[PDB]
């Protein structure tokens, strides 16, 4: 419970952003940041404390936190890059000092890295590498700024593990019109189907975390949205 203003947050993307089908919502980033800030993972309490720094639409059941929208400058644009996570079974990893290989005549059975459950998993994921990441939200600038600057949260998939979509130089600029939920009838974040907002149909929980809770039908924006950084800083 605190006075909440429409803010647009623009940050410099330092690593490619991996989008999990639905565009990463700023409310999910803030939920992770709060889960880190209050050392408790329970969705209920973290949500309860997220409402104190984000406006929550009760009649619509969503947080006023627009989805990810890439800010592209005339010099750098939205690009297609691959976030590549590859097993590195080093010789030091592959050594008797760390484990006891099954032996046959004093020879150690080599790990079959080619295939099988012990393979060198070369997982490639689509990632988007734009110069800037932008979100819009109706909230307290102070708390969200502190969280995004100091909480270990990125934009996209598994920022903890893959370090995807890391950002720095978080800049918050106040907006004149609330562009978090709706904009000329185009949904700017996951919103329920019945809201009358048009976009792309999908299945996902409305409130974060977006990997627990019944996946009800929702309308969400285009996963990859691009705007000129000048158009975004115009306000």
């Amino acid at each position: 419970m605190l006075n909440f203003k429409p803010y647009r947050v623009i940050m410099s993307s330092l690593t490619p952003v991996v989008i999990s089908g639905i565009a990463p919502s700023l409310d999910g980033i803030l939920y992770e940041a709060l889960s880190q800030a209050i050392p408790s993972n329970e969705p209920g309490v973290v949500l309860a404390r997220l409402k104190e720094i984000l406006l929550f639409n009760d009649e619509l059941g969503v947080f006023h936190a627009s989805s990810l929208r890439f800010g592209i400058t005339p010099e750098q644009g939205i690009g297609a890059t691959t976030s590549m996570r590859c097993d590195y079974l080093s010789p030091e990893k592959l050594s008797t000092a760390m484990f006891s290989p099954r032996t046959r005549r004093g020879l150690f059975t080599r790990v079959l890295l080619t295939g099988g459950p012990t393979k060198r998993r070369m997982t490639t994921r689509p990632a988007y590498s734009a110069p800037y990441l932008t979100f819009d939200f109706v909230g307290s600038s102070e708390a969200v700024e502190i969280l995004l600057n100091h909480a270990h949260v990125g934009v996209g998939y598994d920022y903890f593990s893959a370090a995807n979509g890391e950002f720095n130089n978080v800049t918050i600029l106040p907006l004149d019109i609330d562009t978090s939920i709706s904009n000329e009838g185009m949904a700017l974040r996951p919103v329920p189907v019945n809201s009358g907002l048009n976009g792309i149909k999908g299945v996902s929980p409305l409130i974060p975390p977006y990997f627990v809770g019944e996946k009800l039908n929702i309308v969400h924006p285009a996963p990859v949205r691009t705007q000129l950084i000048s158009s975004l800083l115009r306000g």
Binding site: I10, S12, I72, T73, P74, G77, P131, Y132, N169, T171, L173, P174, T226, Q227, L228, I229, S230, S231, L233, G235
Partner: protein
Amino acid sequence: MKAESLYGYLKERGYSRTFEAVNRNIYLENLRKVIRKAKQSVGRGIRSENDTVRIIILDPRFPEPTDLSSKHRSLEHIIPVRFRREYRSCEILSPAYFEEDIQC
């Protein structure tokens, strides 16, 4: 020589950082001194709550509002937080060509 001599300090005190690293550290320290000095300069502007100042920064290197990746972006901190909105909406004497690029 501050960079060189400070490098001598770190070298003889055992710290291993190359001379170019000390050059960078000295550069960043000086740039933060420049930020403080320019903040003082802008503070000259307004002293009374009724003061109205038209600040004209004629340096080309002062970051443009649209250039969030500009090299001297920290200089944007010179403007007080409260007056950052007029910083974003500021008349540019000699701006740099923008366009209507269809790939927006």
